[PDB]
Design a protein around this ligand. Structure first.
Ligand SMILES: C[C@@H]1CC[C@@]2(OC1)O[C@H]1C[C@H]3[C@@H]4CC=C5C[C@@H](OCCC(CO[C@H]6O[C@H](CO)[C@@H](O[C@H]7O[C@H](CO)[C@@H](O)[C@H](O)[C@H]7O)[C@H](O)[C@H]6O)CO[C@H]6O[C@H](CO)[C@@H](O[C@H]7O[C@H](CO)[C@@H](O)[C@H](O)[C@H]7O)[C@H](O)[C@H]6O)CC[C@]5(C)[C@H]4CC[C@]3(C)[C@H]1[C@@H]2C
Ligand SMILES: CCCCCCCCCCCCCCCCCCCCCCCCCC(=O)N[C@@H](CO)[C@H](O)[C@H](O)CCCCCCCCCCCCCC
Ligand SMILES: CC(C)[C@@H](C)/C=C/[C@@H](C)[C@H]1CC[C@H]2C3=CC=C4C[C@@H](O)CC[C@]4(C)[C@H]3CC[C@]12C
Ligand SMILES: CC(C)[C@@H](C)/C=C/[C@@H](C)[C@H]1CC[C@H]2C3=CC=C4C[C@@H](O)CC[C@]4(C)[C@H]3CC[C@]12C
Ligand SMILES: CC(C)[C@@H](C)/C=C\[C@@H](C)[C@H]1CC[C@H]2C3=CC=C4C[C@@H](O)CC[C@]4(C)[C@H]3CC[C@]12C
Ligand SMILES: *Cc1c(COP(=O)(O)O)cnc(C)c1O
Lengths: 74, 184, 555, 537
């Protein structure tokens, strides 16, 4: 009652702990940057579009934020 | 000549102004059998504020340009919304997905909202928004005679006159501009 | 090499392949017994909502996709028209279909098409084996390379775990291929009826509780060809707005007047009936010939029950007939697996016509109808499928005999009870844990179908892709079948999965949800009235012993 | 003109219904008084924003006439006095009880050439009878290699799939059959369906809608009729195998459409079939192909009884006439239980139609997949049939001798006629229009007009006395044949109240490829004697 034929992919935490990662100066940015690299991406409809259209949409969001922000100072 | 055992023949128009004929017993069952999905989302949650949000974003985006004066920024956002509303509500006839038998294939989305019932809350909201937008624009920014005249003649013949109960199920055919409409 | 490869069968000893298909129980403390709901009304369901901005974002995304979608086709078909010869007229013949009628499948479903249909080889047990493909162009054609990797499944319909390749059921089927053959004689009305068909008809009748039964060969065939036998242009049919397609095809063919009512409202129905009786027939104002009420035993999309105690009372004050469909509840619900008529305590003679199928639980394709005596006699001659269609084969029937007996407790002593408590326990355990972690789930606190809601459109394909790598299979739905705001993923439990697999499932779904920001709960879901966000270890340690109690479940 | 007159009542009656109208209009006046143009434009738009908001819901005009002048006392009286009808009428349930008490049941043996039957709830028992009612014509599913493929598939794949065609259900063995059928019949692809009876009603509505035109045969089977009813499109009819009528009908439709000046041309179809289910004669293909090419029509052929009986090998009607299926026929609907030897059904066509069918067909999207052993067994039979073609030659030889024996006779010329074709494997017999009159006194036209009027009036009871007498007489001939001699034959079983097209009771004899010439010759003589003995007296 303890044998099967499936291989278990280890959980995301487990892989790091085995390889020996327990540090934390620029170590608390790799993960914090990745967290910011999902909030912006997911909520916009980026998966359903095409490459050419997504290229224009990414450029559009960059320029709109830039013009809004630099005009704030000036 | 000979006539068929079962006849479902679409009929064109023979006059400039014509009305979609009332449906028969079989058409009534087809429409009533399945609840529609084009007109259901109007009553759902968060389907009223989204019009206020779109107006605000369009005003801010158009105001972002440096050389645009406040008069022409209001006229632009009034142009974009009135044109956009008219295209979505009163232009595309039928249904996008597959409805049984194509019974909903001669009426627009506005007359498809809430089972042709009139004077419902949703119709009260959608007819009260453009009137407020036109009033605030013309009071907030001073206009001359030419611009005030033009924007009025877009607002009226584009967002209010079609939605009136009188113009319901009415099709206008001009021998050159639009083809012979489908009356049945 | 551009085709789907024909996979070879893996080779192993006997014990190993008896654990791939049906896992054994861990401890005797993982069993729960259902109790009846006699004498208690059904409370109104409670629903949860996410914050405003999520709904606002969903509207913005669909508006953007729709605007972009129409623009692509107009520029294409009008200007570059030599790569779209399959959507334009060619030398006097109209095209097979039009652009508008197919604007959704081509333009909003094509990119997510890799998830929807998957080739598989092997028996669908608690581990399902899948072939591997690599996507080319943008899902235009697929290339297959010849490997197999097992995956845990939550999609296949084996509620009681009869889908086995080595056991009593498969022994009985193999013996039949010797005595009978795999060929059907023809229409049941002239030749092709054997004693095996008669025995199953009697066994189905005793099991469910009515007086007599009939047996067909397709669930779609059973319902589609049934309604025209006793309805005409002078009848009225009142049906719910969330019923299955097989029922609807029978009615539109019949031609009776159809009126529908909002789902879950037991008042608006009464206003509809009092109105329709007085008005009468159209254009003539004459009384209706008969009024029929259709409903469903359990709705798959929502996972909520039908208030049978109310419907039985209403069909008695106004003299209306009643029709009930129990496909997802015949063999796996109730205290002893008989259906909605048992869990609510209503007497079986109140309902007029019953229906069901064999695929979902007992493990074979077919269907049955049960009614009173004189009702069956007239329907046996007025029906068209009996005299024109084909008949069902023997091995499908032989298993259905050797499964309706195990659950009933005749051929096997203690396996039916040991297969109706496990599925009850698993559904109790998964539903409480997901509610405690912070997700939003629908249901009636016992339905095996557990839908989880995802609102943003891009979040659905990402969730599905991410977990096949994590080695788990799921299924999703979209706008053409569900409201614009609400999209969901659907879980199907089984009697084979154990406590450990649920733990293994819970860990992976916890991490995925945290990454995608999926836990958006409120105080209405819990019972105390305050939001909750618990740690994973506390959930796994406490939930298994608290899922048996009832007071913790909201509905 | 005097149009300004009515507008005055409106805007005065509007302001008096409004709780305050004099003040608000006065306030708007004084604030924007510079130019009248402005004050006009805003006094209007806001007010109809007010009046429309203050109005009340109004319902559309429906067919049912409203009764708003009824007090609650009446509505309680009307609802109480209502009296419904029974669910199914038990008035005449005993009259048709003989057709269900005569159904033979086989006891613990496969349906083969020699079986054992009992009738009427174990009351009577007959043993070692000669079967002539089976619907299988080749008997290749009973061989050893087919059985071994079945057992292995059962062990390794279980009994049945547990998922719809959409996701988990389609599997590797399924796709193998689709590739195999397409290669064998020379088509680009194919699609499998759960049941043959639900094939035509599920594919025809997919490609047909309102505004189309369909030209169908004078008499077709029931499933074709159901497909036409669900299509929701104009449907014409032309005489049974009359090319002049088909040409005249197609010429008229084309000329009318050209004169109409319509922007987009609609979809047109031609619906017929191969070996007819009720008549059992053959349809001419070359005329249909030449007519569809000149007049721009699509062709739809529903062959079920000719898949494995026609042609030098068994590829269907296309092989028999020496043509190709890629260009002759657009849509083909077939079945597997009649000849191949297992349940199911398939559709043949090019790639575009199959792709649209995977998503737009109700019976495929919303139903489960076929079991594994059915698919593997058929694939084995296809491989055996392609390897050798001896069974088809023998079946063709017996069918020709059977029809020749009953149609070259002379003493049955005044009682029965043969309405079949020499290539058909089933022989149908009816009664001459003169003999039927002498004992029952009615014709086909009188039956069709009576039933059509009965259906239109929507009466609750449908019962025809002379039609029942003919059915009882035919069943008497079948019973006599079986009691004295060990021969079992069947009669064409129909449900009259579901038919729209004219039809008459008949009697049919089947055949297959595992009999012998000596046995079939003696069965022919015994049936001949049975028909005479009952009729002559
Ligand atoms: C700032 C700059 C500038 C401005 C700008 O941005 C950039 O602004 C940008 C914003 C853009 C608009 C955004 C959104 C729309 C609405 C859309 O709505 C489609 C509505 C679809 C459904 O509608 C029909 O629905 C039914 C089915 O057809 C009809 O009735 C049935 O009745 C019975 C039902 O059973 C049966 O009899 C039949 O089924 C039938 O009769 C009903 O009458 C009719 O309404 C139709 O769409 C198709 O219509 C054509 C025909 O199918 C397509 O093919 C033809 O298109 C051209 C035609 O001349 C030529 O190329 C060729 O002839 C040929 O290819 C065409 O490709 C395509 O549009 C049409 C395009 C438009 C205006 C865009 C244009 C481009 C912009 C102006 C951009 C622009 C660039
Ligand atoms: C002189 C000329 C000057 C040119 C100036 C240029 C002006 C640009 C005008 C752009 C107009 C674009 C309008 C596109 C609308 C086309 C929609 C056709 C789709 C047909 C589908 C029929 C049924 C599906 C309906 C449905 O389910 N809809 C829903 C989605 O599922 C529905 O989409 C969502 O709930 C959101 C509703 C938001 C409502 C806000 C409308 C405000 C106006 C927006 C215009 C934007 C203009 C951008 C430049
Ligand atoms: C430049 C365009 C936008 C102008 C000319 C459009 C005006 C249209 C919409 C107006 C002008 C006259 C109006 C009109 C004329 C006559 C009648 C007949 C009457 O029994 C009901 C109202 C009805 C049907 C209305 C409908 C709307 C019409 C046709
Ligand atoms: C900006 C445009 C759209 C404005 C001016 C036009 C509106 C139309 C619809 C209005 C203006 C005058 C109205 C009008 C004039 C006169 C009459 C005759 C009266 O016995 C009944 C109402 C009736 C028939 C209405 C119908 C609707 C009309 C024609
Ligand atoms: C008055 C001018 C400035 C116009 C442009 C302003 C507002 C419009 C929308 C208003 C003003 C008067 C209104 C009006 C006048 C008279 C009638 C006839 C009545 O039987 C139905 C309503 C109807 C058809 C409405 C329709 C909407 C109208 C025409
Ligand atoms: C599953 C479904 C069917 C499908 O019947 P099958 O025999 O599985 O093809 C019929 N009825 C209901 C209610 C269903 O959910």
């Amino acid at each position: 009652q303890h044998k099967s034929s499936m291989v278990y992919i280890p959980t995301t935490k487990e892989a790091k702990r085995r390889n020996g990662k327990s540090e934390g100066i620029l170590n608390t940015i790799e993960e914090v940057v990745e967290k910011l690299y999902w909030t912006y991406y997911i909520h916009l409809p980026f998966y359903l579009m095409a490459s050419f259209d997504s290229f224009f949409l990414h450029v559009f969001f960059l320029t709109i934020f830039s013009l809004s922000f630099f005009g704030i100072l000036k | 000549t000979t006539e068929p055992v079962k006849d479902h023949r679409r009929r064109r128009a023979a006059a400039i102004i014509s009305h979609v004929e009332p449906e028969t017993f079989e058409d009534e069952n087809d429409q009533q059998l399945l609840p529609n999905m084009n007109a259901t989302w109007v009553d759902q949650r968060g389907a009223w504020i989204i019009h206020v949000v779109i107006i605000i974003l369009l005003k801010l985006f158009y105001n972002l340009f440096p050389g645009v004066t406040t008069e022409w920024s209001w006229t632009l956002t009034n142009m974009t919304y009135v044109i956009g509303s008219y295209v979505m509500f009163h232009l595309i006839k039928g249904t996008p997905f597959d409805f049984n038998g194509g019974a909903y294939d001669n009426l627009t989305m506005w007359e498809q909202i809430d089972d042709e019932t009139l004077y419902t809350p949703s119709r009260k909201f959608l007819i009260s928004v453009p009137i407020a937008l036109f009033l605030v624009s013309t009071h907030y920014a001073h206009y001359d005679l030419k611009l005030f005249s033009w924007n009025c003649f877009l607002t009226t013949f584009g967002a209010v006159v079609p939605k009136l109960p009188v113009t319901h199920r009415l099709r206008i055919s001009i021998p050159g501009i639009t083809g012979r409409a489908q009356i049945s | 090499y551009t085709r789907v490869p024909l996979c070879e069968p893996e080779e192993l000893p006997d014990d190993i392949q008896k654990e791939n298909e049906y896992g054994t129980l861990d401890s005797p403390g993982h069993l729960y017994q259902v109790k009846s709901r006699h004498g208690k009304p059904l409370p109104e369901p409670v629903v949860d909502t996410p914050p405003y901005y999520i709904s606002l974002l969903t509207y913005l995304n669909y508006l953007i996709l729709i605007i972009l979608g129409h623009v692509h086709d107009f520029l294409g078909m009008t200007f570059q028209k030599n790569k779209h010869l399959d959507l334009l007229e060619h030398d006097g013949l109209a095209p097979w279909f039009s652009n508008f009628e197919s604007f959704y499948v081509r333009r909003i479903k094509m990119r997510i098409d890799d998830c929807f249909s998957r080739p598989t080889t092997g028996v669908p047990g608690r581990f399902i084996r899948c072939i591997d493909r690599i996507s080319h162009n943008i899902n235009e054609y697929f290339t297959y390379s010849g490997a197999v990797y097992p995956c845990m499944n939550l999609s296949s319909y084996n509620y009681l775990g009869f889908a086995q390749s080595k056991g009593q059921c498969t022994d009985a089927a193999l013996e039949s291929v010797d005595k009978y053959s795999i060929q059907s004689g023809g229409p049941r009305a002239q030749i092709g009826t054997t004693d095996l068909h008669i025995k199953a008809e009697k066994l189905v009748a005793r099991f469910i509780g009515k007086e007599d039964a009939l047996v067909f060969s397709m669930g779609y065939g059973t319902n589609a060809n049934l309604f025209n036998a006793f309805l005409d242009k002078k009848c009225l049919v009142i049906s719910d707005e969330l019923n299955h397609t097989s029922i609807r095809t029978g009615v539109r063919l019949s031609g009776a007047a159809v009126r529908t009512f909002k789902h879950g409202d037991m008042v608006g129905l009464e206003k509809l009936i009092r109105e329709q009786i007085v008005l009468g027939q159209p254009k003539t104002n004459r009384p209706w010939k008969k009024i029929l009420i259709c409903a469903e035993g359990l709705f798959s999309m929502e996972g909520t029950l039908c208030n049978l105690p109310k419907l039985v009372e209403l069909k008695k004050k106004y003299k209306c007939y009643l029709f009930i469909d129990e496909a997802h509840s015949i063999g796996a619900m109730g205290p002893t697996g008989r259906g909605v008529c048992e869990i609510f305590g209503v007497d079986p003679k109140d309902v007029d016509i019953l229906m069901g199928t064999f695929t979902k639980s007992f493990g074979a394709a077919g269907g049955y109808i049960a009614a009173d005596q004189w009702i069956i006699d007239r329907l046996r001659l007025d029906l068209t499928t009996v005299s024109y269609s084909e008949s069902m084969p023997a091995p499908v029937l032989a298993q259905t005999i050797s499964s309706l007996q195990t659950i009933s407790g005749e051929i096997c002593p203690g396996q039916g009870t040991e297969r109706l408590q496990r599925i009850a326990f698993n559904s109790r355990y998964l539903r409480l844990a997901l509610q405690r972690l912070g997700f939003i789930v629908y249901g009636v606190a016992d339905s095996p179908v557990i839908p989880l809601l995802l609102y943003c459109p891009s979040k659905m394909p990402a969730f599905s892709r991410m977990m096949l790598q994590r080695r788990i299979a799921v299924v999703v739905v979209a706008y053409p079948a569900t409201p614009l705001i609400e999209s969901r993923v659907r879980f199907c439990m089984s009697a084979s999965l154990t406590k450990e697999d649920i733990d293994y499932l819970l860990r992976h779904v916890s991490e995925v949800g945290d990454k995608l920001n999926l836990k958006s709960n409120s105080g209405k879901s819990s019972y105390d009235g305050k939001r909750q966000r618990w740690d994973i270890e506390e959930v796994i340690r406490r939930t298994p012993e608290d899922c048996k109690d009832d007071k913790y479940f909201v509905n | 003109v005097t149009t300004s007159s009515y507008l005055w009542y409106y805007f005065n009656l509007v302001l008096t219904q409004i709780p305050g109208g004099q003040f608000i209009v006065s306030y708007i006046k004084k604030s924007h008084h510079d130019d009248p143009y402005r004050t006009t434009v805003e006094i209007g738009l806001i007010l109809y924003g007010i009046i429309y908001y203050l109005s009340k819901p109004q319902q559309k005009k429906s067919l049912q006439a409203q009764k708003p002048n009824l007090s609650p006392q009446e509505i309680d009286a009307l609802i109480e006095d209502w009296e419904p009808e029974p669910l199914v009428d038990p008035s005449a349930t005993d009259e048709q009880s003989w057709r269900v008490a005569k159904t033979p049941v086989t006891m613990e043996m496969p349906i083969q050439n020699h079986i054992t039957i009992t009738r009427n709830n174990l009351q009577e028992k007959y043993t070692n009878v000669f079967n002539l009612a089976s619907n299988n014509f080749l008997q290749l599913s009973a061989t050893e290699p087919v059985k071994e493929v079945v057992k292995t598939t059962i062990k390794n794949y279980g009994v049945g799939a547990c998922g719809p065609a959409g996701f988990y259900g389609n599997q590797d063995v399924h796709y193998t059959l689709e590739y195999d059928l397409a290669q064998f019949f020379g088509t680009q692809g194919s699609v499998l369906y759960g049941q043959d009876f639900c094939a035509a009603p599920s594919v025809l509505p997919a490609f047909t809608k309102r505004g189309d035109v369909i030209v169908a045969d004078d008499q077709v089977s029931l499933p074709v009729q159901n497909a036409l009813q669900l299509s929701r499109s104009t449907v014409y009819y032309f005489n049974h195998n009359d090319m002049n009528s088909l040409e005249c009908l197609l010429n008229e439709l084309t000329e009318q459409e050209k004169l109409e000046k319509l922007p987009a041309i609609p979809r047109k179809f031609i619906v017929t079939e191969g070996i007819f289910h009720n008549s059992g004669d053959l349809a001419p293909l070359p005329e249909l192909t030449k007519l569809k090419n000149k007049y721009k029509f699509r062709l739809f052929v529903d062959e079920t009884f000719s898949i494995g009986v026609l042609g030098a090998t068994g590829r269907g009607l296309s092989e028999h006439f020496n043509m190709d299926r890629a260009t002759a026929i657009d849509i083909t609907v077939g079945s597997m239980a009649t000849a191949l030897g297992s349940t199911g059904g398939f559709v043949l066509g090019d790639s575009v139609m199959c792709l649209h069918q995977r998503i737009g067909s109700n019976a495929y999207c919303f139903s489960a997949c076929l079991p594994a052993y059915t698919v593997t067994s058929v694939s084995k039979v296809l491989k055996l049939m392609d390897s050798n073609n001896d069974a088809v030659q023998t079946l063709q030889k017996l069918s020709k001798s059977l029809h020749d024996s009953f149609a070259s006779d002379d003493s049955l010329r005044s009682y029965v006629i043969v309405t079949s074709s020499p290539v058909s494997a089933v022989l149908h017999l009816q009664l001459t229009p003169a003999y039927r009159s002498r004992k029952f006194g009615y014709t086909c036209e009188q039956l069709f007009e009576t039933m059509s009027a009965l259906q239109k009036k929507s009466q609750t009871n449908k019962f025809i006395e002379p039609y029942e007498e003919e059915e009882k007489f035919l069943q008497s001939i079948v019973d006599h044949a079986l009691i004295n001699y060990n021969v079992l034959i069947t009669r064409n079983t129909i449900v009259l109240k579901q038919e729209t097209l004219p039809i008459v009771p008949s009697l049919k004899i089947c055949c297959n490829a595992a009999m012998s010439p000596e046995e079939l010759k003696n069965a022919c003589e015994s049936v001949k004697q049975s028909i005479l003995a009952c009729c002559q007296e």
